[PDB]
Structure 1
Amino acid sequence: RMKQLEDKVEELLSKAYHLENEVARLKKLVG
Protein backbone atom coordinates (compact mmCIF):
# COMPACT_ATOMS: atom_id res chain seq x y z
CA ARG A 1 0.00 0.00 0.00
CA MET A 2 2.90 2.33 0.81
CA LYS A 3 4.72 2.17 -2.56
CA GLN A 4 1.51 2.50 -4.62
CA LEU A 5 0.58 5.53 -2.44
CA GLU A 6 3.95 7.24 -3.01
CA ASP A 7 3.71 6.60 -6.72
CA LYS A 8 0.15 7.99 -7.05
CA VAL A 9 1.10 11.10 -5.06
CA GLU A 10 4.06 11.79 -7.34
CA GLU A 11 1.87 11.30 -10.40
CA LEU A 12 -0.77 13.61 -8.98
CA LEU A 13 1.85 16.34 -8.43
CA SER A 14 3.25 15.98 -11.94
CA LYS A 15 -0.30 16.11 -13.39
CA ALA A 16 -1.08 19.19 -11.33
CA TYR A 17 2.07 20.95 -12.59
CA HIS A 18 1.12 20.01 -16.15
CA LEU A 19 -2.39 21.38 -15.65
CA GLU A 20 -1.03 24.64 -14.06
CA ASN A 21 1.08 25.36 -17.16
CA GLU A 22 -1.80 24.45 -19.55
CA VAL A 23 -4.05 26.90 -17.70
CA ALA A 24 -1.26 29.56 -17.96
CA ARG A 25 -1.00 28.98 -21.75
CA LEU A 26 -4.85 29.23 -21.97
CA LYS A 27 -4.73 32.52 -19.98
CA LYS A 28 -2.49 33.86 -22.82
CA LEU A 29 -5.35 33.27 -25.24
CA VAL A 30 -8.21 34.58 -23.13
CA GLY A 31 -7.31 36.54 -20.00
Structure 2
Amino acid sequence: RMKQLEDKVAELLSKNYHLENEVARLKKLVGER
Protein backbone atom coordinates (compact mmCIF):
# COMPACT_ATOMS: atom_id res chain seq x y z
CA ARG A 1 0.00 0.00 0.00
CA MET A 2 2.97 2.27 0.68
CA LYS A 3 4.03 1.95 -2.97
CA GLN A 4 0.40 2.55 -3.97
CA LEU A 5 0.35 5.80 -1.95
CA GLU A 6 3.73 6.80 -3.44
CA ASP A 7 2.45 6.20 -6.96
CA LYS A 8 -0.69 8.22 -6.20
CA VAL A 9 1.43 11.20 -5.12
CA ALA A 10 3.50 10.95 -8.39
CA GLU A 11 0.22 10.78 -10.26
CA LEU A 12 -1.35 13.80 -8.57
CA LEU A 13 1.71 16.05 -8.87
CA SER A 14 1.74 15.30 -12.58
CA LYS A 15 -1.95 16.05 -12.91
CA ASN A 16 -1.53 19.34 -11.01
CA TYR A 17 1.42 20.39 -13.20
CA HIS A 18 -0.78 19.69 -16.24
CA LEU A 19 -3.57 21.85 -14.77
CA GLU A 20 -1.10 24.64 -13.98
CA ASN A 21 0.05 24.48 -17.58
CA GLU A 22 -3.57 24.75 -18.70
CA VAL A 23 -4.24 27.75 -16.45
CA ALA A 24 -1.19 29.46 -17.99
CA ARG A 25 -2.35 28.58 -21.50
CA LEU A 26 -5.86 29.93 -20.89
CA LYS A 27 -4.51 33.05 -19.17
CA LYS A 28 -2.45 33.65 -22.33
CA LEU A 29 -5.57 33.27 -24.45
CA VAL A 30 -7.37 35.75 -22.19
CA GLY A 31 -4.72 38.40 -22.79
CA GLU A 32 -4.81 38.23 -26.59
CA ARG A 33 -8.55 37.49 -26.51
Q: Which runs of 5+ in 1 are unaligned?
A: none
- After superposition, what is the alpha-carbon deviation per residue over 1:1-31, rounded to whole angstroms, capped at 9, x for unaligned? 1010000000000000000011100001114
Q: CA RMSD in A?
A: 0.9
Distance 1:29 1:22 in 2: 10
Runs of 4+ in 1 over 6 A off after TM superposition: none
Q: Which runs of 5+ in 2 are unaligned?
A: none
Length-normalised TM-score, structure 2:
0.83
- Name the larger-Rg structure: 2
